[PDB]
């Protein structure tokens, strides 16, 4: 596929960063190229599309480099985004949920009125690794009674399970590593 | 009808947050309404062409919010979006800049090969407060030998004088409040 060539062509891999023996898989070169960026999101959105038809009613973006693709995501599908952050950031009532990232603690954060009950969202983030990010971001959303159709990355690190963590939550990437 | 009257009428104001005295400038139901989003992306693009026509290369978009809007900017300027990113979170080679951030001090980290000598950018982050994050992205850009044609925001609070900060790097916002 050479839209999806376009994509791939544009990832980037740093051995050792940021710690030993792993492999970082870099997304600048996809936003550096219109071209790679345009067929990432309408990637997403065909399958998006092709998948729940008009069931969608927001896409949510995961800080920091899913808010890359959320909006334009969104946009794509004649959707609003709907913003869960890095906690500490966000004004207003929120709500948490701690996940593990590295060696400690991370928590993602959701204002109370981001979503009523029932709102049916699609979660976009770069990349799913152990899943913990993305997991942490359906519970916030459970929490407001939304539903998690799916959620979607441009990359996925297969040996990691975040797909297993997910389910029965659906999940979709455009490129799969190790 | 009025773009303009399209995002402001969704900047939600948040006194007190995060300390006593200031008011919060949330960009978020902006992002959840496509057509806001829309006319924000919309506004900043013409601006942009009317002022630089074929001089710009690349959008550079601030970590985090300011990724909410790069991609989509450059998108719609048929452009790259190159990433600034808080120290710590970019592989490879990268250069790094200090800026005063509340009562202390942040960092902010760009890859070397982020753009080559000569290449002309347009900086975008949502908000342009005391202007410290942006004359650090700047300072960085500077550093690549790269021209720094004009930075922008969808929001400026200009009794914090951010637009002299950045001075002679001309400046543009959507909205302006005290
Ligand atoms: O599946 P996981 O093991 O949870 O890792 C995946 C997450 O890690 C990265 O975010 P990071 O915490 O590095 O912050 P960033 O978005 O600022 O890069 C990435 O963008 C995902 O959000
Ligand atoms: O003009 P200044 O006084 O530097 O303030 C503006 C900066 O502050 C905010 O980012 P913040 O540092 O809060 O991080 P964020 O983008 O993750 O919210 C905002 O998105 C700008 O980047
Ligand atoms: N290998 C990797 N590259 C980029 N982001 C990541 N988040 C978790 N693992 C990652
Ligand atoms: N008042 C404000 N609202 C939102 N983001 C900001 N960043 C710096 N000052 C801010
Ligand atoms: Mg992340
Ligand atoms: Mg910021």
Redesign the pocket.
């Given at each position: 596929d050479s839209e999806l060539q376009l994509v791939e062509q544009r990832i980037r891999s740093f051995p050792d960063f940021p710690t030993p023996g792993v492999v970082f898989r870099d997304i600048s070169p996809v936003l550096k190229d219109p071209a790679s960026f345009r067929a990432a999101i309408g990637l997403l959105a065909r399958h998006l599309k092709a998948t729940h038809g008009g069931r969608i009613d927001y896409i949510a973006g995961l800080?920091?480099r899913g808010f890359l693709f959320g909006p334009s995501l969104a946009q794509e599908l004649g959707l609003g985004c709907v913003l869960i952050?890095?906690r500490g950031?966000l004004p207003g009532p929120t709500l948490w949920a701690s996940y593990s990232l590295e060696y400690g603690k991370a928590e993602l954060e959701i204002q109370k009125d981001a979503l009523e009950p029932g709102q049916r969202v699609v979660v976009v983030d770069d990349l799913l690794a152990t899943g913990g990010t993305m997991n942490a971001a359906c519970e916030l959303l459970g929490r407001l009674q939304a539903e998690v159709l799916e959620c979607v990355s441009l990359v996925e690190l297969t040996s990691l399970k975040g797909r297993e963590k997910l389910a029965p939550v659906p999940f979709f990437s455009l490129l799969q590593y190790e």
């Open positions: 800080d920091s952050r890095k950031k």
